[PDB]
């Protein structure tokens, strides 16, 4: 019976592939062919944030567009005032091995996680004047690779156990569990309306999940290696995935298959972080070659290089107003770019 | 000075945060980082117990005015290549090998020899691109069990090309040589082999002086005298 069922699964896969091929009349490179090129995009480092001693793994900006949070392997979670490079807070982490960090949209909480399989939420606005561990979320059997805040009470976390989780912070339990990935999930990205989110895993596929229903709406498979980063388009109708095969890919939810591929012959290193500009025209991708490129989303042409780091660029963020772009790398320094 | 009173106080707070971070980093930099690795039932638990006597589990201990951190990653059911780069820069790697596994067939469940799987893991981590300079500290655990196993169970089960006799010394030396031959970074790193047991008490001393040798080597590389 298993053979018949897998043959039916293959027939369904072939039907999906035929449907995708049928609804592909023109390529993205043909519609976005006569449009004006973006031109050479040059950004200088405006601020350099020093104070981290070990290698940085994640950062998140926040809605206020001024503060930001950075996580490093030294065991410290540092909140920076990017305007003046001041350190607003320095939280000593219980577990030094952290690979992700999130800053709440309201700004009252900050999240972190890593090899300890626990997502720690810290209350920034404490009456005592310090920063306390508001909540510890456990239940994942793999390392936390990404985590983002729906609001002050709900959080979405991706771990290496091939599953994602939706937690209610107040009760500390998993309200929802998203399964279906056959590989470790390395990143997630929430839609602007917080109704859907995409998760990229090590199975070379990115899956779209509905937060409320809890089911997998769609899956996209165009990559040839592990997917390390993912980011929604500003309008929420598309997303971009970076992978270890030195290629980025722009997929569309409504089209249901891949739109664009971003690759160059002299780039052979994987992508550790991708991000979109405010308008979505520029796709900034951090590579393993110590650099960070700025691709043109519509034209797929390279627009500029952010080469100011002496080690792997591990994390990338763009302010909600798009004013500046922050790059955090393994050389223990963050850099703001304009 | 264009800053205001609140701005000046914020800058003072930032400077105090910097001074605390520097002190914490100086405290951390005087501490030894050991990455504990091994197969299932290899003997990591008894090594942790010996360290205590004298997600991720961390063990902290002290010997001869040196503080040792030992990260027993253990039950991390995930791809090793997605988080193994976090552990580069550790002072040493402590790999545990169970000798009595030389004739134990089940691996995870693949039904291919456990010693071969341990050798494959050792080859994978020793030749890993991140640990190109980190020195392995190989522990051949369960020597008491092996000393009785080899008497009645020949080593040819694991190594068909073994032409030596079935004695403790020859078979143990052969296993050590086979493990050391998997090292391809002969010049950059050294492998420190120690034959431990269930009830021996010299393990922490071996870790101490192996780390001392690694520190001397690193100091010579910093000076360039090596």
């Amino acid at each position, epitope marked *: 019976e298993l053979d018949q069922l897998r043959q039916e699964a293959e027939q369904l896969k072939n039907q999906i592939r035929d449907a995708r091929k049928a609804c592909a009349d023109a390529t993205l490179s043909q519609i976005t062919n006569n449009i004006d090129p973006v031109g050479r995009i040059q950004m200088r480092t405006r601020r350099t944030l020093r104070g981290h001693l070990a290698k940085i793994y994640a950062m998140h900006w926040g809605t206020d567009s001024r503060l930001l949070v950075s996580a490093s392997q030294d065991g410290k979670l540092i909140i920076w005032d990017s305007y003046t490079t001041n350190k607003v807070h320095a939280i000593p982490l219980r577990s030094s091995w952290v690979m992700t960090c999130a800053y709440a949209p309201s700004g009252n909480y900050v999240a972190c996680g890593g090899l300890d399989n626990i997502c720690s939420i810290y209350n920034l606005k404490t009456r*005592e004047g310090n920063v306390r561990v508001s909540r510890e979320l456990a239940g994942h059997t793999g390392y936390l690779s990404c985590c983002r805040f729906l609001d002050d009470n709900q959080i979405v976390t991706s771990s290496g156990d091939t599953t994602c989780a939706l937690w209610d912070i107040e009760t500390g339990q998993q309200t929802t569990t998203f399964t279906g990935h056959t590989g470790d999930v390395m990143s997630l990205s929430l839609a602007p309306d917080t109704r859907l989110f995409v998760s990229g895993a090590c199975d070379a596929s990115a899956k779209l999940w509905d937060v409320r229903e809890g089911m997998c709406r769609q899956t996209f498979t165009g990559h040839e290696s592990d997917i390390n980063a993912i980011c929604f388009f500003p309008n929420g109708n598309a997303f971009a995935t970076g992978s270890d095969d030195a290629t980025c890919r722009l997929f569309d939810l409504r089209a249901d298959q891949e739109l664009m591929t971003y690759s160059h012959d002299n780039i052979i290193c994987g992508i550790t972080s991708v991000s979109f500009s405010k308008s979505g025209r520029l796709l900034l991708a951090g590579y393993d070659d110590f650099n960070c490129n700025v691709w043109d989303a519509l034209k797929a042409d390279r627009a500029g290089v952010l080469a100011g780091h002496d080690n792997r660029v591990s994390c990338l963020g763009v302010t909600d107003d798009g004013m500046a772009v922050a790059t955090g790398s393994w050389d223990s320094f963050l850099k703001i770019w304009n | 000075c264009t800053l205001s009173a609140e701005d000046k106080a914020a800058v003072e707070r930032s400077k105090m945060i910097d001074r605390n971070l520097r002190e914490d980093g100086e405290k951390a930099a005087r501490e030894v980082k050991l990455l504990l690795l091994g197969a299932g039932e290899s003997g990591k638990s008894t090594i942790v117990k010996q360290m205590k006597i004298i997600g991720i589990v961390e063990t902290h201990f002290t010997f001869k005015d040196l503080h040792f951190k030992m990260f027993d990653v253990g039950g991390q059911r995930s791809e090793r290549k997605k988080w193994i780069h976090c552990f580069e820069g550790v002072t040493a790697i402590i790999f545990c090998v169970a000798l009595s596994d030389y004739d134990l067939v089940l691996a995870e469940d693949e039904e291919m020899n456990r010693m071969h799987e341990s050798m494959k893991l050792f080859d994978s981590i020793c030749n890993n691109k991140w640990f190109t300079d980190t020195s392995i500290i190989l522990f051949l655990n369960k020597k008491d069990l092996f000393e009785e196993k080899i008497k009645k169970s020949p080593l040819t089960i694991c190594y068909p090309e073994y032409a030596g006799s079935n004695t403790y010394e020859e078979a143990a030396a052969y296993i050590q040589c086979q493990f050391e031959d998997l090292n391809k970074r002969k010049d950059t790193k050294e492998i420190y082999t120690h034959f431990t047991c269930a009830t021996d008490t010299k393990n922490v001393q071996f870790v101490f002086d192996a780390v001392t040798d690694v520190i001397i080597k690193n100091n010579l590389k910093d000076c360039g005298l090596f």
Partner: single-chain antibody
Amino acid sequence: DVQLVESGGGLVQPGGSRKLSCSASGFAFSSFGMHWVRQAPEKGLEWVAYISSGSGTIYYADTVKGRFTISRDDPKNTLFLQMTSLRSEDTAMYYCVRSIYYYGSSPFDFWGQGTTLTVSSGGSDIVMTQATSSVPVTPGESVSISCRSSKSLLHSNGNTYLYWFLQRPGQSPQLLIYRMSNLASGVPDRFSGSGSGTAFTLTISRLEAEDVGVYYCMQHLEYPLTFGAGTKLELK
């Protein structure tokens, strides 16, 4: 919760010496800068002394410069004010106030109860002026408390350093609005701050019975802190 208790007040002859102790509880004392503030029996508040976190910087008022010494004992969580050569003008009630400074912080968040000192018998600073001494107000209405400054309180960084405090009868002052716009934690949304430059106003909507008291206007731009004359609020 969070509390500060003042001790060491008593009858003093002129030219004597005295020491005031603020004992803190319920918060990270070492991370908070500390202020000593004076309130004479009939007139308004006036800032006396300040010591930062870790004793990095210390500031005094010209009235108490030289005679007074403010210090902090972080491990025992105590704030000391050693005052010498006491004149008769220092008889007042003293408050120890906590204030933390970072982006988005709320300094002067909490005030101590105060201790009583009874001593038995200028220029180049911002003059904060509250012209109206008091207004008769019927509860349930909307009242506006005005304020003025000799020098503009708006800095080049976009922050207007104006604070609003309410001192109920028999109670320590309570912070209502910090930086002229932001509402303090636990403060009802009735209070609203506005204004620009040198003129500011505080608006209260749907006044209720616990709003009666004296409202004080304080500036934090130039560090010789000056409070307003105060505006008493009384029922009809």
